[PDB]
Each structure stands twice: as C-alpha cells, then as structure tokens.
Design a protein around this ligand. Structure first.
Ligand SMILES: CC[C@H](C)[C@H](N)C(=O)O
Ligand SMILES: CC[C@H](C)[C@H](N)C(=O)O
Ligand SMILES: CC[C@H](C)[C@H](N)C(=O)O
Ligand SMILES: CC[C@H](C)[C@H](N)C(=O)O
Lengths: 75, 75, 75, 75, 75, 75, 75, 75
C-alpha cells in the first residue's frame, strides 16, 4: 500500500472548493486548508505507486485551480 | 489577540488598488509595497484565530486582484 | 481546537527514533517518515493556539535531534 | 530612510533568544517569532542602504544561531 | 553538440499533449512527466548553442501549452 | 547614483518583446534573455533609490508579462 | 522500476570529482555537470522506492561534497 | 561569442577582494558587489561555449573564496 501527503498551492479563494472536490475522491483520506506557502495539505492512500502516479496526472493536474504541488511519500 | 504577516502577489497594475483596500480595513496594522517575489507585506491583528480564519479566507483571498498569499502567524 | 501539520528535518539517521518519541506525545495524532525535502510529517492538535505555541517552541524545537520545523496551521 | 523586513531561519530552539538580542538593537523596530518556513520576521529602519548592509553584515550574518535570511526592502 | 535539460510547467490537462509534441521532435532525446513543481523534464541535444537558442526560443517557449521553463545547459 | 540588476521571469514566449520594451526606457542600460530560473536580466541606473522604487512600481509591475522579479542593488 | 532525476548543489570546484563517483554507481544511468542553481543532474533507476531512499541516504547524503539535493520521481 | 552572468556567494568579508581578482581577468567585462542573496554579479564573455565551460569550472569555481555560483548564459 502507498500513503502520501500532497501539499498544494491553489488560485486565491479557490482552496475551499478544491478541497471539497478532493475530499469526494476515494483516494483522499484527509484534506485541510492551511496557512503558509502551501494552501492545502492532502493525505492520499493508493494500492501502488503507479496508482499514485495516475492520481497526480489524471486528477490533480487536470484541475486548473491547483498551481504547484509537492508530494511526500511515506516510507 | 492574534497577529500575522501576510505576503501577497497582486495582478499587474493593481498593487496600489489592493493597498487602498487594505488601508481601509480595521484589521490591517501596517502595509508596505516591497521588492521581490511578493508585491506587498501586511501586518494584521484579530481578536481570535477563528476571526483570522474568516478575515483571510473571505476578505483577503477572495479579493479579485489577489493572485497568491502566504500568511505567517506570530507567537 | 487547533490542528497543524509540522514538516520536519531531523539529524541524519534519527528519523525513526524521533518519530517514536513524537508518537508518545498526546498532542501528536499522526506521524510519518517520508521521502523528500522533509524527513517527517506530523499532525498535531491542541485545545488553543497559545498551547500550540508552547508545544512547538518549548517542546518540539528543543528536541536535540530536530534541526528544522515548518508548521502549517489548519483553517 | 530605508525600511526593510528581514525573514530569518534560526537553529531550532534558539529563535526567542535571537529575537531578544535583535530587539535590543536600535535599528530593529519590531520582531516576532512566526510559523512557517521562516522562524522570525524583523522590521528594520536605517538612514541609508549602506547602513542596512552593514547591519546585516556586522550584526545579522555574525550571529551563529541565524542560518538563513531573506531581505525585503519596503518602498 | 550541446546537451541541455529543460524543466517545464504546462497548462492543466495539457502535459500529455505537450509530451506528444516533444516526442516527435528530433532534438528531444528523452522526456518524462515528473512529480513536483514542474510537470516535465526533457533532455535535448542540438549541434550548436545558436541552434539551442533557436529551438528553445521558438519551438519550446512559444508552445501555447507551456507556462514556464527552466533550462539547464550541460558541460 | 544607484545601479541595480533586476532578474525577471516572464510569461513563456514573451521574454523578447518584454526585453525590447525595457531597452526603450532611459533607466535601462542593458538587458539580456537568459537560460535558467530567470528569463531576463536587466541592468538599471537611477539617480536615487526613490527613483528605483518608482521604476519597479510604475514600470515593471504594470507589465502583465512580467511574473516574478528579484532586484540586487550594487553597493 | 523507479526512475528519478536528482538535482544537486556541490561544494564549489568539486562537481566533477563527485560526478565521477556517482557515475561509478550501478543505480546511476547518466550524470552531467550543469549551469544554473544546481551543479549536477543525475538520472537514477532502482527496483523500489525503498531502494531509492536507501541510495540517497547511504550514498548521496553521505557525500560531504554534496550540499543540497532535490529529487524528482519520474512517472 | 558567449555572454553569461554569474551570480556568486563568497566567503564572508571576501567580496571586495574576490571582485578585484575577477576584474583582472580578460573574460570579466563587468563585476559588482550587491545587496541580496548573492554577493556579486559578474558579466563574462568568451569566444565559445567550450571556453566558458573551462573558465567557470577550472578557474572561477576553483577560487578558494567562492562558495557558490549560478551562471546564466545569455541568448
Ligand atoms: C488560509 C491561508 C491561505 C490558504 C494561504 N496559505 C495563506 O497562508 O495566506
Ligand atoms: C513557532 C514556529 C517555528 C519557529 C517554525 N517557524 C515552525 O513553523 O515550526
Ligand atoms: C531562453 C531561456 C528561457 C527564457 C528560460 N530562462 C529557460 O531557461 O528555459
Ligand atoms: C558549470 C556550472 C556551475 C557548476 C554552476 N551550476 C554555475 O552555473 O555556475
């Protein structure tokens, strides 16, 4: 199994709507709007790294409101 | 009382327009146009953290001219 | 209640031992060793902001093994 | 007169003692320990740019506890 | 021969579209979608530096889907 | 007198047109499109720091094609 | 299989000697000294994520000449 | 001809002495001590890219007083 945290910067004022969309996805276990350089922190759990790759490319990167991400995979 | 410093990037030709909105807000204690990656730095104070949350999420991040923000809460 | 995520950098080879010490703290709700710029991601919760201030400055940052912390307070 | 905000990263656990030292300097108008990538924010005011550079050089950079800094001159 | 690595950020939902354009170009030796701040990394080779200049300025930076690039020329 | 170098990131494919506009300004002495994290490097010379401040706010920041800048003042 | 690009900053003047050491490692597929903020780019391939972390930990991070690194896992 | 701008970080208090040594090199066309993240900005010109490669790696980065360099090649 894979557990990872994705830190994201979103367009100003869209963090809440983006968070709600992410929370509705099965891969997403937790999501919070936060203070600092990043706007959202999202915890995801997938069966494989390939699945995590697909979550990033097929879900995250197709959302225009998300601008910059940093992913940290638990080990 | 909660004190925080907010770094902001505004749309081109709008940093003065944003400063004018900021300098009319009760929560804004000081505001400066600065050199660098960010256009402005603003020191704000609210009674509680819940109030800061509302202020930043609603009055700052939804301001049309704002493109990005990074808030540093102080101790 | 205040929720925050602490991104940490520990001295080399101390990640695991630091994590076990953190997991013993009542404020720590989740802790993970991760691959990336940061060595650990820790979810903490306190009753007030003043308590978090105390926990981060007097407990967490005083741990000999911890070199850097970047705390993201949740809205 | 030159006004500038200096963001600094300190050795973990030394931010308060550093802030107190800084607060004792005449050029320092305000100083706060903050959450985020940076640990301290300081507002300084000097008569000239020359004096600002001398300040960070003779005082700031000569403080072992201070590890990294970013200066933002106010306009 | 000049070799360079180009880090690129593309518009949302366009990273595959860009990869398809890149993988049809003679100058592209390898191309990968990557995690992080950048969406793709591409290794290119040209006969001369003047050719690289033309290639990057005209075929890469004018590509409609490209939002930002950072090119690292190799020795 | 003040001499400074301004490093800038521009929208992809607009670096040349931005450079031409800057070169036409009396304050600008040299300008080059460059490889790396920055897209343009511009050398400016003004009578006072106040004039440099005005160049940044009234000229640079009103140009939508310019996205992020870093200014280094000679001393 | 996991493929990743590692960008590194080395002590000034030690980049080539470091590159040669890296090139002697089986996990390293290619390596180049480059212009820019980073001094070296290395492409590595390991069977697992676990092995990638062990690689940078046992080899990369244990090289005194290497001062800073940024890893980008390829999808 | 190849033109490049080298952004440098020197050991503390060595900026001026490093600058005078650089000004003596035929490749160096302009050199300035500056306020900011970098200590010096140096404009250099060589007849070919291969010569610049040699100049930066075998001359510049071998200078004991220089700690970091980020070279931006001009188009
Ligand atoms: C609510 C905080 C927002 C999202 C941003 N991260 C900031 O610090 O300003
Ligand atoms: C109290 C905050 C400390 C100093 C650090 N900046 C952090 O966010 O963890
Ligand atoms: C010509 C280079 C462009 C402007 C950008 N700086 C890059 O490195 O890709
Ligand atoms: C040859 C390039 C060196 C290593 C450094 N990255 C620079 O740009 O100055």
């Amino acid at each position: 199994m894979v557990t990872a945290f994705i830190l994201m910067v979103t367009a100003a004022g869209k963090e809440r709507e983006v968070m709600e969309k992410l929370l509705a996805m099965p891969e997403v276990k937790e999501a919070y709007v936060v203070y600092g350089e990043y706007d959202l922190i999202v915890k995801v759990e997938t069966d494989t790294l390939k699945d995590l790759d697909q979550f990033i490319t097929e879900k995250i990167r197709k959302m225009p409101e998300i601008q910059m991400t940093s992913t940290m995979i638990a080990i």
